[PDB]
Amino acid sequence: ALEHLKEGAPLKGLFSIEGLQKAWFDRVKYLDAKLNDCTNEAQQKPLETLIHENSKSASKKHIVNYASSLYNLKFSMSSLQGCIRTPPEECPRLGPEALLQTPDFNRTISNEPLTTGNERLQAALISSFGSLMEFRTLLINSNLAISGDGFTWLVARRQDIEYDKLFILNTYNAGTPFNFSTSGVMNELNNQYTNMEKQRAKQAKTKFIYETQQKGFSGKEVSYIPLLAIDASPKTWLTDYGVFGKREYLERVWDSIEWKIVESRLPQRT
Amino acid sequence: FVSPLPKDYVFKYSNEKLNVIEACFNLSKNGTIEDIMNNLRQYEGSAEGKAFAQEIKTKLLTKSPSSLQIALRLVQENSRDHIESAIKRDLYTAANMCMNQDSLVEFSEATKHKLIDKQRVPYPWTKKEQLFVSQLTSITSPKPSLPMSLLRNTSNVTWTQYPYHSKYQLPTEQEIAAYIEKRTNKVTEREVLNHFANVIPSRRGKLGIQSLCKIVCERKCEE
Amino acid sequence: RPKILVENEIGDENYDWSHMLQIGRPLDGESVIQRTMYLIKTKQYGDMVEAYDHARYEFYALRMQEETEQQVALEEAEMFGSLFGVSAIEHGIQKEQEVLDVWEKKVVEETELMAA
Amino acid sequence: TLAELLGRSRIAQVANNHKPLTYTGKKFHPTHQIIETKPSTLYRQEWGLKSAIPSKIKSRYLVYNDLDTLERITTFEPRGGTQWNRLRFQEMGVPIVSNIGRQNPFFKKFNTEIIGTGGLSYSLPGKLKNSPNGVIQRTVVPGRILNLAAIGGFVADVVFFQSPPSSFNSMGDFIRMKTFLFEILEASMEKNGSVSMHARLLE
Amino acid sequence: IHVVPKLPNSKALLQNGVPNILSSSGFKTVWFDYQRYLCDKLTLATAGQSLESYYPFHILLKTAGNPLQSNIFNLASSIHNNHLFVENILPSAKTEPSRLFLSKIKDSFNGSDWEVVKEEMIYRAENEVLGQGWLFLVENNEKKLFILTSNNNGTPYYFPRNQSFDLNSAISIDEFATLKQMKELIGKSTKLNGKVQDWTMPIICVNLWDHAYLHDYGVGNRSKYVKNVLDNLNWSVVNNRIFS
Amino acid sequence: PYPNLIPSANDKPYSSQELFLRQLNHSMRTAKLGATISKVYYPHKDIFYPPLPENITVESLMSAGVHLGQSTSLWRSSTQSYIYGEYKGIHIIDLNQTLSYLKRAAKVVEGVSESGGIILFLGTRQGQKRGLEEAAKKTHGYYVSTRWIPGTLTNSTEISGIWEKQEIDSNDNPTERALSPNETSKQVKPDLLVVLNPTENRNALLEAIKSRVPTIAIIDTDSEPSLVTYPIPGNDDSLRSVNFLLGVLARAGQRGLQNRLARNNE
Ligand SMILES: [Mg+2]
């Protein structure tokens, strides 16, 4: 699907000739085939649109999950680029000592947006997070914490396609970064359950709590424009970096982000 | 007032090194330094042990041959004989070294080179050959030319082996072997350790005695 | 942050203060201080104050990482249908409630006494 | 040496202080190091102090000043409430940020003043928290109104659209009984080390 | 400090792996490295706490009810679950499944065959868990067995932390109702910690994490891996963890 | 095992007892599973697996808390030689000294056990009882946790008059023959009084020195060391440090008992 990566020669920074294939080319194939098996239609269309159509539905659930999985990976890979560091095939794999190493995210900073233009994006990040280093710590540490199949998302709060404020969120297995598609499904289910019980307070209080959790400061609902995705699953990093080198992998990913794409994704501010 | 050894303590002389020492340095009635050197050269076994043997051969070569031969001659005789006689013999050989008539023990010059003049660099030596047994005897024995005598003690006593050492130190391999033989006439390592670490009243609280016994068992006996 | 003072074998430990995170030991101010002392000994930072600052900065990152770990673990649990019967804040509220009930009955009696 | 071991060891690690265990004044942060036991060690009265501690104490946590006094008793108080306040704060998940335009102190002779927060929160402000129901915009927390509102081990300033008479005026000075929900807006931290929260009453 | 236990015929395992299901490298990835990593993480979490003294299972049971300190629970759960999985795998320490076990299965699954049950388990594994997880065949206080999937570090023992289905994705009405019922049951417990009674015991744990299969079987073929594991597992161990 | 267990019907679920048994079985086989926990202190392990006098270090003593003396203001200056320095408003006991005295004490405990003497472990503090009883069991010895009635040795005939005496082999077999009333009424004095709180039972110590019995005591930084034959400098207040010293002593006496049994067998 993507242009920047290929089957013969992967990125010099992150992945290796075999490890890249295991991470990306094989996974994508598995997902697409699975999606085809689920739905008789072979038309790809947009993935996001399909998700929106089939969300809040247990029967049309698997397909949605597979669309999310495909989309998220693609989003992650679009952001990535080459790097200065040596390939993991040359380097030795990290042992149990990697756990005890102090992280340098607090003290050091590298590969900022400023170095390749992207000034307004950097300013927006600073406004959101206090600084670049603080943002980075938020991102990488969150990704480490996921511990399983998941994705860390840099997002923008959609209220032209205007935005209010940048944010970051984690999402797991095949969870979407878009709030509007899944906002209030649990509340609806609760309401249905209450209706069923009636047919056959605390519940009212719980509903009220749910409502106040969901609803924003003004608008009827809220949505998030994704700017950056970073995968957290063993699928990618176990091949090259082993068990102990998740943090190292994340560092490498961070070094090799193409910030121009992220800047382009970022819409105009209010 | 003793204390246990640290948890990072390792006994310097490994098993393979001890085995190669045993192979090389054990000699017959008429053993020599040359024979030892030959044995070291032709030893075969572990690679590390072979390297060790080579290293010790090198350091023997570096040191003086005549003095080594004299020491070799002395040690078997001293093992055979009793304390006072051995001391006398040692005194006689020291005297001979001091006043070398035959001029075959370059000692005073070597001392000057080392102790007086400079700490660095070994002495080149000016005498390197196999001395005869009669010559060796003459070197380590008295004559009527000079009178020799030790100064008299209060307790003018003589014995072949020490009266009080064996009790108050770690027990020799030989003693362990003797115990094993006695036990035979089943036996196991733990039982041996218990016997040595608990039953023997002088050696109940010996510091590194169990470890020593284990090392001995590893070296000699089999399952 | 609670501190267990009941020692485990003091002889058994073997901490290289090249880094803060030791295995048997937890992350705390002590670990920082040990790191500062190590730095002083090695003369990476000749000054004591600078070494202390460095150790503090090492600690902070680790603490932030620890904080993020727990929150994300909680999020994961929430996502995959885990059920926690009593949350910490809920527990606290419950604890307060009993005390308040005790106070109220007593306070009413005291007001009655004051009236009479 | 022994001296070195003593300096390393867990009693030397507890930094000494002779502050009151009973302080009826304003408490903005922890005074004393909380010290826990395991259940097993509690069962045989051992806390890793000079002496055994009375069998009357069944709580695992405590606070102390002196290992041994002239009165032949350790000066302690069996309570570790400050950890629970911190844990409540963490649960609430409202990240402390300096309202004054300043860099975060954790990033980059001696200053005894509190470096940023005192370590109740090493959380960073930029994150969102998703759930089955969705992305939580407003943090819902139950608290008690005093007259100010007690919200999960912290007193907090409160604001509302209209002052509700039915709940308030029915029980004027027994408002502490009824727990109300709150929407915590933000948490600032002043120079004295007080956490100045700001909540909003929900009905 | 928590350290990995010494497996029987460890050197042989290192040389080979496991005859049928896992390679030398694949076994190292799942156990000799990953388990060690997990143990180290657990130690780091619970170094100076009261939890340091307790075993992983007992830690998990202590922690389960607490919403915060979920990381500890996750780690403890993983450690225990992974060693159960390894125990199930091991060649020795040929054995067939027990007669009693077969009778129990028959009682549970409407008088179906063991092959059929296996097939149902693999289908459940395929369908239920996305990403990582665990696949247990458990036994509860009602003597009949049942199949239990968990989504990453969900324990088979304590039902509020079964972690049995993903609410990140959309869910059914029946599933929601079941969740609501569980929540109600939890609320009914009435203790200060708020922890229900539960007597679920795992009989056949299987590791649906990528640390087991991904090296040998690739990103796909997790089902195939699960099938292989089911075919070749230590039956004596299973028999031992069955009777009251 | 479990002869009265009424097992539930196959169609029915598990009973409560059956369920409990199943849990126990699980605990024995597969609960302690996931990991093993090296390098951690279990309180019980010091009573049931104390180290030999040889293998004790200064580090182990420090971990036990033996170094922590009474207080700076509760100082008997008689004990000055034993104390290392002061810190945290507390005198700290020199622990090399403690070690040497402990070894000396341990050796005398072993010796009397070997000779077949009556060792008596005296420990009036609250938590000490169980460990004291264990120590008394270990060597074929005796203990006192409930208070020492003044004059058990000095006024033995009045106090310890109506309790059963026994006979014993070179081994420890009762050889149950009838003791004569003259044979019974004689005092049976200990050959080692070993106390865990000498400051709390001065009387027992005084009785021992009058009754001509060698005695061992955990001398804290407020206790008089001259009042006993073999003082061990250390922390008598904390329960675990006392247990550690006591357990060591018991182990030393146990060894000597074992040696005596071996030589009897020979
Ligand atoms: Mg005292």
Q: What's B21-39 look like in SS3?
A: HHHHHCCCCCCCHHHHHHH
- Cα distances (angstroms) measured from residue D54 to each of D46, D74, D75, F46, F126: 10, 10, 12, 21, 9
Nearest CA in chain F to C11: F59
Handedness of CA A16, A18, A23, A29 (dihedral sign): positive
Q: Do C69 and A141 touch (CB under 8 A)?
A: yes
Strands (E), F22-146: 36-37, 83-86, 91-93, 119-122, 142-144
- Chain D touched by E169 (CB under 8 Å): no
Ligand 1 center to residue F42 CA distance, Å? 24
Nearest to C15 by CA among C45, C47, C38: C38
Place of tokens 């693999």: E122
Cβ contact B148:B85 at 8 Å = no
Classify each residue of F108-126 as buried b or exposed e, where b means 16 or more C-beta atoms within 10 Å of its C-beta.
bbbebbbebbbbbbbbbbe
Residues of chain E with Cβ-Cβ distance to D40 below 8 Å are 53
What pairs with residue D181 in β-bridges?
A: D142, D202
Instruction: Give the one of E55, E199, E241 whose C-beta lies nearest to F32's C-beta.
Output: E55
Q: What is the rounded CA–CA span in Å between residue B181 and residue B189?
A: 13
Pairing between β-strand F119-122 and β-strand F142-144 as defined by DSSP bridges: parallel
Estimate to the nearest angstrom the gap between the alpha carbon of A226 and the chain centroid.
Answer: 8
Cβ contact B106:B64 at 8 Å = yes
Cβ contact E183:C80 at 8 Å = no
Instruction: Give the one of C3, C87, C94 whose C-beta lies nearest to E48's C-beta.
Output: C3
Measure the CA angle with vertex A50, ends A44 and A55; round to 5°.
155
Query: Which phi and psi angles does E137 have, rounded to 5°?
Result: -110, 110
Instruction: Give the one of F21, F30, F40 whose C-beta lies nearest to E241's C-beta.
Output: F30
Residues of chain C with Cβ-Cβ distance to A107 below 8 Å are 57, 61
Minimum distance, in Å, between the CA of residue E167 and any CA atom of chain C? 5
Instruction: Give the one of A22, A174, A192 whose C-beta lies nearest to E169's C-beta.
Output: A174
Q: Do E55 and F21 touch (CB under 8 A)?
A: no
Q: What is the rounded CA–CA span in Å between residue A38 and residue A44?
A: 13
Residues of chain C with Cβ-Cβ distance to E182 below 8 Å are 83
Residues of chain E with Cβ-Cβ distance to C79 below 8 Å are 166-168
Task: Classify the phi-psi angles of B172: left when phi > 0, otherwise alpha if psi is within -120 to 50, otherwise beta.
Answer: beta
> Which resolution, in Å, applies to this structure?
3.8
Residue type (1 letter), A130: G
Q: Do E186 and C26 touch (CB under 8 A)?
A: no
Q: Do F41 and C8 touch (CB under 8 A)?
A: yes
Q: Do D133 and A137 touch (CB under 8 A)?
A: no
Q: What is the rounded CA–CA span in Å between residue B150 and residue F169?
A: 57
Classify each residue of D157-169 as buried b or exposed e, where b means 16 or more C-beta atoms within 10 Å of its C-beta.
ebeeeeeeeeeee
- What one-character-per-residue DSSP string does F45-79 give? HHHHSPPPTTT--HHHHHHHTTTB-S-SSS--GGG
Q: What is the rounded CA–CA span in Å between residue F195 and residue B22?
A: 53
Q: Which helix (H) or strand (E) holds D37?
A: none
Protein residues near ligand 1, an ion, with CB under 5 A: F 220, 236-237
**Cβ-defined contacts of E7-13 (< 8 Å, 24+):** E7/E31, E7/E86, E7/E90, E8/E90, E8/E92, E8/E93, E9/E91, E9/E92, E9/E93
Residue F19 tokens, joined: 């369920």
Classify each residue of A160-195 as buried b or exposed e, where b means 16 or more C-beta atoms within 10 Å of its C-beta.
eeebeebbbbbbbbbbbbbbbbbbbbbbebbeebbe
Nearest CA in chain F to E86: F34
What is the DSSP secondary structure assignment for residue A80, as one 8-state letter? B
Interface subset of D 92-151, CB within 8 angstroms of A: 97, 103-104, 106-108, 124-138, 140
Estimate to the nearest angstrom the gap between the alpha carbon of A76 and the chain centroid.
Answer: 7
- Cα distances (angstroms) measured from residue D128 to each of A157, A179, B174, F174: 11, 11, 76, 78
Classify each residue of C74-83 as buried b or exposed e, where b means 16 or more C-beta atoms within 10 Å of its C-beta.
bbbbbbbbbb
Q: What is the rounded CA–CA span in Å between residue D106 and residue C64?
A: 9
Query: Which phi and psi angles does A68 have, rounded to 5°?
Result: -60, -50
What pairs with residue A229 in β-bridges?
A: A153
Q: Strand, helix or coil at F99? A: helix
Longest dimension (CA), chain B: 62
A–D interface: beta-carbon pairs under 8 A = 87
Q: Strand, helix or coil at A182? A: coil
Measure the CA angle with vertex D93, ends D92 and D95; round to 5°.
130
Residue B10 tokens, joined: 């390792």
- Chain E touched by F2 (CB under 8 Å): no
- Cα distances (angstroms) measured from residue B178 to each of B172, B204, B217: 10, 19, 13
Q: What is the rounded CA–CA span in Å between residue C91 and residue C78?
A: 19
Give chain E's length. Answer: 244
What pairs with residue E205 in β-bridges?
A: E136
Cβ contact D10:C7 at 8 Å = yes
Q: Do D131 and C78 touch (CB under 8 A)?
A: yes
Ligand 1 center to residue F222 CA distance, Å? 6
Estimate to the nearest angstrom the gap between the alpha carbon of D21 and the chain centroid.
Answer: 16
Minimum distance, in Å, between the CA of residue A47 and any CA atom of chain E? 15
Minimum distance, in Å, between the CA of residue C8 and any CA atom of chain F? 5
Nearest to B24 by CA among B3, B2, B50: B50
Residue B145, C-beta contacts closer than 8 angstroms, at least 6 positions apart: none
Task: Classify residue B109 as exposed, middle or buried by CB count within 10 Å of its CB (0-12, 13-18, 19+).
Answer: exposed
Q: What is the rounded CA–CA span in Å between residue D2 and residue D5?
A: 5
Q: What is the rounded CA–CA span in Å between residue D122 and residue D184?
A: 18
Residues of chain C with Cβ-Cβ distance to D5 below 8 Å are 10
Measure the CA angle with vertex A54, ends A53 and A57; round to 5°.
140
Q: Do F30 and E5 touch (CB under 8 A)?
A: no
Q: How far apart are the first and last CA of chain C?
A: 49
- Chain F touched by B4 (CB under 8 Å): yes
Q: What is the rounded CA–CA span in Å between residue E27 and residue C86?
A: 39
Q: Which helix (H) or strand (E) holds F220?
A: none
Q: What is the rounded CA–CA span in Å between residue E153 and residue E134?
A: 7
Classify each residue of F142-153 as buried b or exposed e, where b means 16 or more C-beta atoms within 10 Å of its C-beta.
bbbbeebeebbb
Nearest to A27 by CA among D32, F264, E243, E221: E221
Q: Which helix (H) or strand (E) holds E226?
A: helix E222-231
Q: Do F240 and D46 touch (CB under 8 A)?
A: yes
Strands (E), D117-154: 140-145, 149-150
Place of tokens 């998941």: A150
- Chain E touched by C93 (CB under 8 Å): no
Residue type (1 letter), F246: L
Minimum distance, in Å, between the CA of residue D132 and any CA atom of chain E? 5
Residue F181 tokens, joined: 């009333």
Place of tokens 């202190």: F41
> How many C-beta atoms surround the C-beta of residue B131 within 10 A?
19
Residues of chain C with Cβ-Cβ distance to D41 below 8 Å are 6
Estimate to the nearest angstrom the gap between the alpha carbon of F118 and the chain centroid.
Answer: 14
Q: Which helix (H) or strand (E) holds E17?
A: strand E17-18
> How many C-beta atoms surround the C-beta of residue F178 within 10 A?
8
Q: Strand, helix or coil at A79? A: helix
Q: Which helix (H) or strand (E) holds F233?
A: strand F230-233
Ligand 1 center to residue F199 CA distance, Å? 7
Give chain F's length. Answer: 266
Place of tokens 């696949």: E135
Q: Strand, helix or coil at F219? A: strand
Nearest to E214 by CA among A38, A5, A18: A18
A–C interface: beta-carbon pairs under 8 A = 56
Residue A51 tokens, joined: 């998700």
Task: Classify the phi-psi angles of F232: left when phi > 0, otherwise alpha if psi is within -120 to 50, otherwise beta.
Answer: beta
Minimum distance, in Å, between the CA of residue D50 and any CA atom of chain F? 6
Pairing between β-strand F36-37 and β-strand E2-3 as defined by DSSP bridges: antiparallel
Query: Which phi and psi angles does C26 have, rounded to 5°?
Result: -80, 175
Query: Which phi and psi angles does C59 have, rounded to 5°?
Result: -55, -45
Q: Strand, helix or coil at F122? A: strand
Q: What is the rounded CA–CA span in Å between residue F166 and residue A231?
A: 79
Measure the CA angle with vertex A175, ends E120 and E61; round to 5°.
65
Query: Which phi and psi angles does D155 have, rounded to 5°?
Result: -85, 140
CA atoms within 13 A on the CB side of F261: 12
Give chain B's length. Answer: 223
What pairs with residue A56 in β-bridges?
A: none
Q: Do C19 and A100 touch (CB under 8 A)?
A: yes
Q: Which helix (H) or strand (E) holds B143?
A: none
Estimate to the nearest angstrom the gap between the alpha carbon of E72 and the chain centroid.
Answer: 17
Nearest to D11 by CA among D73, D67, D75, D80: D67
- What one-character-per-residue DSSP string does A111-166 give? S-SGGGS-HHHHHHHHHHHSSHHHHHHHHHHHHHHH-SSEEEEEEEEE----BS-E
Q: Do A155 and D106 touch (CB under 8 A)?
A: no
Chain B contact probe: residue of F54, F108, F257 with most B CBs at under 10 A: F54
Q: What is the rounded CA–CA span in Å between residue B205 and residue F103?
A: 10
Nearest to C61 by CA among A113, D107, B215: D107
Q: What is the rounded CA–CA span in Å between residue A222 and residue A169?
A: 14
Handedness of CA C92, C94, C98, C104 (dihedral sign): positive
CA atoms within 13 A on the CB side of F249: 37
Minimum distance, in Å, between the CA of residue A234 and any CA atom of chain E? 6
**Cβ-defined contacts of D6-11 (< 8 Å, 24+):** D6/F62, D6/F67, D6/F87, D6/F92, D8/C10, D9/C7, D9/C10, D9/F62, D10/C3, D10/C4, D10/C5, D10/C6, D10/C7, D10/D48, D11/C5, D11/D48, D11/D49, D11/D67, D11/F68, D11/F88
CA dihedral A227, A233, A238, A241 (to 10 degrees): 40
CA atoms within 13 A on the CB side of D182: 29
**Structure-solving method:** cryo-EM
Ligand 1 center to residue E130 CA distance, Å? 63
CA dihedral B25, B28, B30, B35 (to 10 degrees): -40
Task: Classify residue D40 as exposed, middle or buried by CB count within 10 Å of its CB (0-12, 13-18, 19+).
Answer: middle
- Cα distances (angstroms) measured from residue F112 to each of A253, B200, F102, F260: 73, 17, 16, 10
Pairing between β-strand F192-195 and β-strand F119-122 as defined by DSSP bridges: parallel
Give chain A's length. Answer: 270
Instruction: Give the one of F23, F29, F34 whose C-beta lies nearest to E79's C-beta.
Output: F34
Nearest to F239 by CA among D53, D61, D35, D72: D53
Q: What is the rounded CA–CA span in Å between residue E20 and residue C91?
A: 51
Ligand 1 center to residue F218 CA distance, Å? 9
Q: Write down the H helix ranges in E134-193.
A: 173-188
Ligand 1 center to residue F119 CA distance, Å? 23
- To the nearest 10 degrees (0 to 180), the angle between helices E210-217 and A234-241 is 70
Q: What is the rounded CA–CA span in Å between residue B38 and residue D201?
A: 97
Q: Do C11 and F57 touch (CB under 8 A)?
A: yes
Cβ contact E220:E154 at 8 Å = no
Cβ contact C96:D151 at 8 Å = no
Cβ contact A189:E179 at 8 Å = no
Q: What is the rounded CA–CA span in Å between residue E243 and residue B193?
A: 43
Give chain C's length. Answer: 116
Chain D contact probe: residue of A152, A213, A221 with most D CBs at under 10 A: A213
Cβ contact D90:D80 at 8 Å = no
Chains E and D touch (3+ CB pairs under 8 A): yes
Estimate to the nearest angstrom the gap between the alpha carbon of D174 and the chain centroid.
Answer: 25
Residues of chain F with Cβ-Cβ distance to B3 below 8 Å are 57-58, 96, 99
Longest dimension (CA), chain E: 53
Query: Which phi and psi angles does D168 have, rounded to 5°?
Result: -75, -60
> How many C-beta atoms surround the C-beta of residue D115 within 10 A?
12
- Chain C touched by F42 (CB under 8 Å): no
Cβ contact E65:E194 at 8 Å = yes
Residue A141 tokens, joined: 């540490």
Residue A56, C-beta contacts closer than 8 angstroms, at least 6 positions apart: A181, A182, A185, A188, E170
Chain A contact probe: residue of C20, C38, C75, C82 with most A CBs at under 10 A: C75
Chain A contact probe: residue of D135, D137, D138, D161 with most A CBs at under 10 A: D135
Q: What is the rounded CA–CA span in Å between residue F167 and residue F184?
A: 10
Task: Classify residue C55 as exposed, middle or buried by CB count within 10 Å of its CB (0-12, 13-18, 19+).
Answer: buried
Give chain D's length. Answer: 203
